[PDB]
Amino acid sequence: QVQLVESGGGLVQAGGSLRLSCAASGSIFSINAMGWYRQAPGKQRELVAAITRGGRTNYADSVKGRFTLSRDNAKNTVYLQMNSLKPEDTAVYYCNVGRSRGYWGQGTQVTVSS
Amino acid sequence: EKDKLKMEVDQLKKEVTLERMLVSKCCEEFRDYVEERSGEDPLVKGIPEDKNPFKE
Amino acid sequence: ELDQLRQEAEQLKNQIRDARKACADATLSQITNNIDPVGRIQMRTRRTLRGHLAKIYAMHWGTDSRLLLSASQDGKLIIWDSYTTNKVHAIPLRSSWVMTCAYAPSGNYVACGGLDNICSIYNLKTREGNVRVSRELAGHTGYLSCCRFLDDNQIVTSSGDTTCALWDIETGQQTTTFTGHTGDVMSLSLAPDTRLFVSGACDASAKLWDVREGMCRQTFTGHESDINAICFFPNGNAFATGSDDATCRLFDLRADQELMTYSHDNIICGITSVSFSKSGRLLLAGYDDFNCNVWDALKADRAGVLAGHDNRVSCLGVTDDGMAVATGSWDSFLKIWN
């Protein structure tokens, strides 16, 4: 009886932009922190951008300044705006609440070509 | 934040005084606990089909 | 002054490390060198509990070793009779974003919660046939990661707000708060005698807490990533951890340190759950890769595997009589093995 729905991935040219969304079936983002993770072909899953319940963001060093994580509680959605993309950002991006004990989306593939 | 560093050192200060047993003696007692009981552990030994509460 | 404190903390860390180093006189593998390997452990599926419609996140055995309950994102909290497979109850949840559940020792209540940040207590034998929420335990500002009853009136909880708490169920109040963890607390386990409990967290550390005093006695380090699961050893002087770093570890309280690590270099995915067998000879661990590994707790080798879920094993549990291991999975089934 729950849905964590990601959207917005695909293929983009290096330096271009993608707007990943993550839409919850309930108001979970309004009383918990969430995290965006990514997993490239045959590496480990890593954190990319996280947001506390009160709105403090925090990013991995490889994306700092290019990736901005925002939130619209009134429609149970968070957004990861990814600008000036590079080849090494190519991966499957996952929406998460509750960490490894928690809720994950299916993954959105992001492909960055040069 | 200074609030917290003080509680962190207060906890570290308590942990520095802990009387620690030798790892060998801990490992010995651990072993002997397991050795006393593992012959009787149903998941080590196996359960006879008559005594298995999860029969067919 | 932030400088004089970080400088003191640093010196205290080094001094704890040297004191621990000067105690580590021998490894567990030396101590158990006379001991022979256990057999190949080859447990079989005795039951497949069918009923949940989506991922199972948690489960817990009742103290009678027959009744268990399970919590899924499907919105249901099912109490099963493992002997028959008959559902004793199928409780609909207000919030389906469930992350834990607990069976009270008495058999009279279960508890449950998750991204609602609330630990809900459910009364199992009421006046008239219904199963209703007798108490909601609100106060945490982040998700409920785990919960364990001490008795019918007391329950300990862990949370993504970085704290654990002891609650009085009658009053609904937090009697005690346990602070110290610098990251989300993902799991906890009560000592056999319930005077202590251990918690594991995203700070990569585990802490031992005195329930009655409300304070951390001991912090245990070594893990390189989140501690997702934790379980007391049955004599009460040790516990095991499962982590995203792909290791389980065995920590002794009196040594204040790690005795043993359980990992293969070709397993690099996360651990979800850990449980000792009755005697402690076996340490069972669930993984992201769909399997449970059965480890020889004394010899640090893998003794066997439980392979029979089509998605990850999210939770497991050994009965108090030691006769069975329950697994729960993201494929929506629980399995009973022995």
Residue numbers in the entry:
A (entry chain F): 1 to 114
B (entry chain C): 11 to 66
C (entry chain A): 3 to 340
What does the paper say about this structure?
The Gβγ dimer functions as a negative regulator when bound to the Gα subunit. Additionally, the Gβγ dimer regulates many downstream events depending on its interaction with different effector molecules. Gβγ binding proteins, including Gα, PDC, GRKs, and PI3K are key regulators of GPCR signaling known to interact with the Gβγ dimer with nanomolar affinities. Here we describe a nanobody (Nb5) that specifically binds to the Gβγ dimer and shifts the association/dissociation equilibrium of the heterotrimeric visual G protein (Gt) towards dissociated Gαt and Nb5-bound Gβ1γ1 subunits.
The binding kinetics analysis revealed a rapid on-rate constant (Kon = 4.4 × 105 M−1 s−1) and a slow off-rate constant (Koff = 1.9 × 10–2 s−1) with a Kd of 43 nM. Binding of Nb5 to the Gβ1γ1 dimer induced a statistically significant (P < 0.01) increase in protection from solvent exchange in the regions of residues 80–99 and 111–118 of the Gβ1 subunit versus the Gβ1γ1 dimer alone. The differential HDX data indicate that the binding interface between Nb5 and the Gβ1γ1 dimer involves at a minimum, residues 80–99 and 111–118 of Gβ1 (left). Interestingly, the binding site of Nb5 on the Gβ1γ1 dimer implied by the HDX data closely resembles that of Gαt with the Gβ1γ1 dimer (right). Indeed, combined differential HDX and x-ray crystallography studies demonstrate a possible competition between Nb5 and Gβγ regulatory proteins due to their overlapping binding interfaces. In fact, Sc index analysis that precisely measures correlations of directions suggests a structural advantage of Nb5 over most Gβγ regulatory proteins except Gα for Gβγ binding. Furthermore, the binding interface between Nb5 and Gβ1γ1 has the highest Sc index among several tested protein-Nb interactions. Nb5, on the other hand, binds Gβγ with a low nM affinity and has a larger area of interaction with the Gβγ dimer (>1030 Å2). Assessment of the binding interface between the Gβ1γ1 dimer and Nb5 revealed critical amino acid residues that are highly conserved among Gβ subtypes 1–4. While, Nb5 was co-transfected in human embryonic kidney cells 293 in BRET assays, GIRK recordings were performed by introducing an internal solution containing 10 μM of Nb5 directly to the neuronal exons. These results, together with the crystal structure of the Gβ1γ1-Nb5 complex demonstrate that Nb5 interferes with Gβγ dimer association to GIRK channels, thereby suppressing Gβγ-regulated GIRK signaling.
